[PDB]
Design a protein around this ligand. Structure first.
Ligand SMILES: [Mg+2]
Ligand SMILES: [Mg+2]
Ligand SMILES: [Mg+2]
Ligand SMILES: [Mg+2]
Ligand SMILES: [Mg+2]
Lengths: 169, 200, 98, 146, 178
RNA sequence: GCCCCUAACCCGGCCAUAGGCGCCGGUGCUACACCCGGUCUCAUCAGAACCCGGAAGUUAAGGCCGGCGCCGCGCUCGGGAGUACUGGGCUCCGCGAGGGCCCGGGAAACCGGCGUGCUGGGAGGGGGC
RNA sequence: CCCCUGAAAAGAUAUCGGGGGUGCCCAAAGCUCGGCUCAGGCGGGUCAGAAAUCCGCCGUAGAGUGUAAGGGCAAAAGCCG
């Protein structure tokens, strides 16, 4: 897997319609809403933390999942799943392409160089704008320090700069 | 109806009075139309010229106009259809109409129906309406022989049913058997009025 | 690959209709009797596409030169070239600007 | 170029009620069933009455010859013998096409399948010879003898 | 007790009830000579010409193709419908299920074999057939949904109801409704 | 013969402010219907329909008019919002993708409010010439 | 050669750019007239069943329209005669 800097910049149109894309990769994110998702339970919480993007860019699906585990594991063992709701707000609809000489990947991949340079599907990413909310945490005001620490941990696994915004519901 | 993607049809189409596919073919002729319409009691005949903002009607009359010439039969029998045709035919010529095209709407073009009965009277007045030779009713049904023979056979069989099946015929003063005689009576008074009018 | 040139080769958005304009179109455009010298707008009707002019003439203004049976002979221009369009009134509108 | 034909279709020459053996009948029952039925063909069905194949005399004999062959070294059920796959012709099938199918598939018979896909009858060599008997052309045997 | 006088007149003369039409159905698979027997049977049973109802779709599991006649039906009107209806109701036994009624003044029942019908006898060259009997009840003013010009929907108050239908058979047809 | 006014009817234009669900009414001399029959023209399995002949009944329904609620819809109305986006200039910021400033244009969803056919020609009816 | 996209709301527009198709087929799948309404769902109905024929209600086209894609089409451009 190439460095994420190869796929950070938004350089072309979105590539999402999977009826026209051959071999479009499946989304390997198992869960998007962590904690207590039921609306009756979330009325206990009263504070909202948002990990907001600062630059527009593309976040790979593996980077989204990596930030998801480190943040959710920390809130699991420092806050308890019954004391928070954590949602990954974005979905990686954009399909990433790569142009490399490979195995049986179609007949036109055997031609080296920039001839027939349209790449094959190499992953998925989310295209985000500035101010877009990446992670959404509903929580109670006593655990504000822990939720910031978990969100700061998730920020360390993301390719673009992000800032934490804390506001009440 | 439901949702924005629903398409409500045309008002005349959804009310069920205008076949727009047939109307477009009629509008392609670029000639005045002879609208013939049928009701439970009366018959309508009109000479209509279509305009972009709405049809202009030149002459439009119902079967009530025959009372001006003392008609004493049923308002929408075959003979009443032919008499109604002559007046709209004559008044159309006084408005300058030399030719027209039949427009029977949602009615079937069965042979011998009253809609061709109305068109026959229009043709006799002097307005050319092109038509099929084998749909116009015969003279015997035009002059009401089918009505007279029905009453004459029914009187000799069930006279009690005579006074109910032709209850209004008697009160006008005309037994249905003299309808063929009465038809030639009315036809001269419509003819002589409009011919003598045409002299001046 | 270079652009294919069918008679209607980029007419997806041009020939599409909104949901509110679905079905048969009204017959008032059949009832405009154009004379020689009047100005008309070429407005293609997607429901009668067999008799419609080319997409390059959409939105253009011509001069009625005459009638051919039931079509109207219309004189128009494409940039600098004088073109002769022969179309029925269902693909026309009167020009009210002059 | 053989030309003149019966005009007879497959449904005329059919045998409707083929003798049947259930799938878990051993081979001794197969010989006894062949003896009782007097037929050159049997149809095998399961516990649910579902026909799965047809056992012909030649297949049974060849199976016995291949399986039970050793004498220098001197010192099952019916389902194993049946063939589910056979030449098939619908009800309107003609004798010429039926004979061609039987020859090409190398079977003693031909299983007729309906439009719905179900067997209703089988026609073998013997009913073909008999249909020749009621209709068949005039030929000397020198042009048919082996 | 003819068709005009089996009316269930309500408090409005325009609210009367009658039998709009009674129809008989024969669903026979494909048999052309069988269907000819079926057409002959209804032609003698009802006194009216049958109708060959072609297959709407082709289903290979039934071995049927669209466009072939695989049914016989006939629509009975004023006088012919009542007489067969009385004749049919004898074979049923003066008994129709309450659940057999629909919510639109309609009811159908099936006679398993026509030898139970009056005026009928066994025939070995035609066999034994069962039928569907569909009888429709209506009020005056139902033509508004069926005329060609100015077609419209009948009002809610001018449609035969499932309650008004069952009362029709008990009091006017004298049929036991259980 | 003519000008004027005017329901339900006929022929239209635009084709939901016109549609859909439910509720409460008005309309019946004429007109519109339901309606009554099948000799004739005409038609089908079936006079159901179409076609023909008619007038006992009925405003029960259709039609037309009035009112209310809901959905749908419309608006050159208020907020959203001079927002998003954008034509032109820039030795203006940023490592960079990008952003900013000045001149000129300027939404959409959504929220609230309002509206729920308008109208052309003829027939019939009234008035006057 | 043909359709959509690229293509930047007139026109035009390339790449060994993306998704696809063409070298036919049909005496009816061509012409016209008339009638009907499709997918699907529901209620009732002997065989009969998820599905056959029959009676009714709903049903914006969710069908069909030879064949790619896009467009058009409901008293029709679909189905039946
Ligand atoms: Mg780029
Ligand atoms: Mg070129
Ligand atoms: Mg052509
Ligand atoms: Mg362009
Ligand atoms: Mg047609």
């Amino acid at each position: 897997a190439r460095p994420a800097r190869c796929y950070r910049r938004i350089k072309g149109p979105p590539y999402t319609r999977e009826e026209y894309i051959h071999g479009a990769p499946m989304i390997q994110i198992p869960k998007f809403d962590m904690g207590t998702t039921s609306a009756a339970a979330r009325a206990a919480f009263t504070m909202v933390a948002k990990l907001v993007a600062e630059e527009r860019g593309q976040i790979r699906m593996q980077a989204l999942e990596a930030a998801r585990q480190i943040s959710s594991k920390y809130l699991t063992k420092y806050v308890g799943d019954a004391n928070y709701y954590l949602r990954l707000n974005v979905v990686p609809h954009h399909v990433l392409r790569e142009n490399r000489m490979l195995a049986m990947a179609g007949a036109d991949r055997l031609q080296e160089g920039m001839r027939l340079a349209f790449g094959s599907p190499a992953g998925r990413a989310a295209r985000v704008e500035p101010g877009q909310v990446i992670f959404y945490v509903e929580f109670k005001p006593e655990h504000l320090a822990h939720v910031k620490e978990a969100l700061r941990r998730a920020a360390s696994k993301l390719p673009i700069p992000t800032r934490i915004v804390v506001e009440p519901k | 109806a439901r949702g924005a993607r629903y398409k409500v049809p045309f008002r005349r189409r959804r009310e069920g009075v205008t076949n727009y596919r047939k109307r477009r073919k009629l509008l392609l002729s670029r000639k005045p139309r002879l609208v013939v319409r049928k009701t439970n009691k009366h018959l309508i005949a009109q000479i209509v010229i279509a305009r972009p903002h709405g049809d202009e009607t030149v002459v439009g009359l119902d079967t009530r106009v025959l009372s001006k010439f003392g008609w004493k039969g049923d308002e929408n029998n075959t003979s009443a259809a032919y008499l109604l045709g002559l007046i709209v035919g004559y008044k159309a010529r006084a408005k300058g109409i030399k030719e027209a095209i039949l427009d029977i709407g949602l009615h079937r073009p069965t042979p011998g129906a009253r809609v061709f009965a109305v068109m026959k009277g229009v043709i006799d007045a002097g307005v050319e309406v092109p038509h099929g030779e084998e749909v116009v009713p015969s003279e015997e049904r035009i002059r009401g022989e089918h009505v007279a023979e029905y009453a004459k056979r029914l009187k000799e069989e069930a006279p009690e049913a005579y006074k109910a099946r032709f209850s209004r015929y008697l009160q006008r003063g005309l037994p249905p058997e003299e309808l063929p005689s009465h038809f030639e009576e009315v036809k001269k008074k419509i003819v002589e009025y409009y011919e003598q009018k045409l002299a001046k | 690959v270079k652009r294919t040139h069918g008679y209607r080769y980029k007419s997806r958005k041009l020939l599409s209709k909104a949901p509110r304009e679905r079905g048969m179109s009204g017959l008032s455009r059949l009832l405009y009797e154009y004379k020689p010298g009047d100005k008309v707008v070429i407005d293609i009707d997607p429901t009668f596409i067999s008799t419609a002019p080319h997409r390059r003439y959409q939105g253009k203004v011509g001069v009625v030169i005459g009638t051919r049976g039931r079509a109207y002979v219309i004189e128009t221009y494409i940039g600098d070239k004088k073109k002769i369009i022969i179309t029925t009134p269902e693909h026309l509108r009167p020009h009210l600007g002059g | 170029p053989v030309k003149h034909v019966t005009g007879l279709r497959a449904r005329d020459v059919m045998l409707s009620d083929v003798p049947m053996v259930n799938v878990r009948d051993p081979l001794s029952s197969i010989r006894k069933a062949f003896l009782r039925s007097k037929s050159g063909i049997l149809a095998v069905v399961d516990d649910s009455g579902k026909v799965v194949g047809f056992i012909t005399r030649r297949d049974f004999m060849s199976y016995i010859a291949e399986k039970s062959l050793g004498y220098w070294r001197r010192q099952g059920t019916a389902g194993d013998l049946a063939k589910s796959e056979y030449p098939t012709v619908s009800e309107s099938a003609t004798l010429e096409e039926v004979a061609y199918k039987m020859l090409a598939a190398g079977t003693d018979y031909v299983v007729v399948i309906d439009s719905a896909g179900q067997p209703i009858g089988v026609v073998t060599k013997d009913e073909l010879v008999k249909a020749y008997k009621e209709r068949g052309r005039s030929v000397k045997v020198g042009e048919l003898m082996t | 007790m003819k068709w005009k006088e089996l009316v269930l007149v309500k408090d409005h003369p325009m609210k009367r009830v009658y039998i709009e039409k009674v129809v008989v159905n024969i669903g026979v698979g494909t048999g052309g000579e069988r269907l000819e027997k079926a057409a002959n049977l209804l032609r003698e049973l009802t006194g009216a010409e049958p109708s060959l109802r072609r297959a709407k779709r082709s289903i290979k599991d039934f071995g049927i193709r669209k466009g072939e006649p695989i049914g016989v039906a006939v629509t009975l009107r004023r006088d012919k419908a009542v007489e067969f209806l009385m004749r049919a109701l004898q074979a049923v036994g003066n008994r129709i299920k309450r659940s057999s009624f629909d919510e639109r003044g309609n009811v159908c029942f099936g006679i398993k074999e026509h030898i139970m019908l009056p005026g009928v006898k066994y025939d070995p060259a035609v066999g034994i057939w069962g039928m569907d009997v569909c009888v429709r009840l209506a009020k005056p003013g139902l033509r508004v949904q069926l005329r060609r010009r100015r077609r419209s929907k009948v009002g809610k108050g001018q449609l035969v109801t499932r309650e008004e239908a069952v009362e029709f058979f008990q009091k006017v047809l004298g049929v036991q409704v259980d």
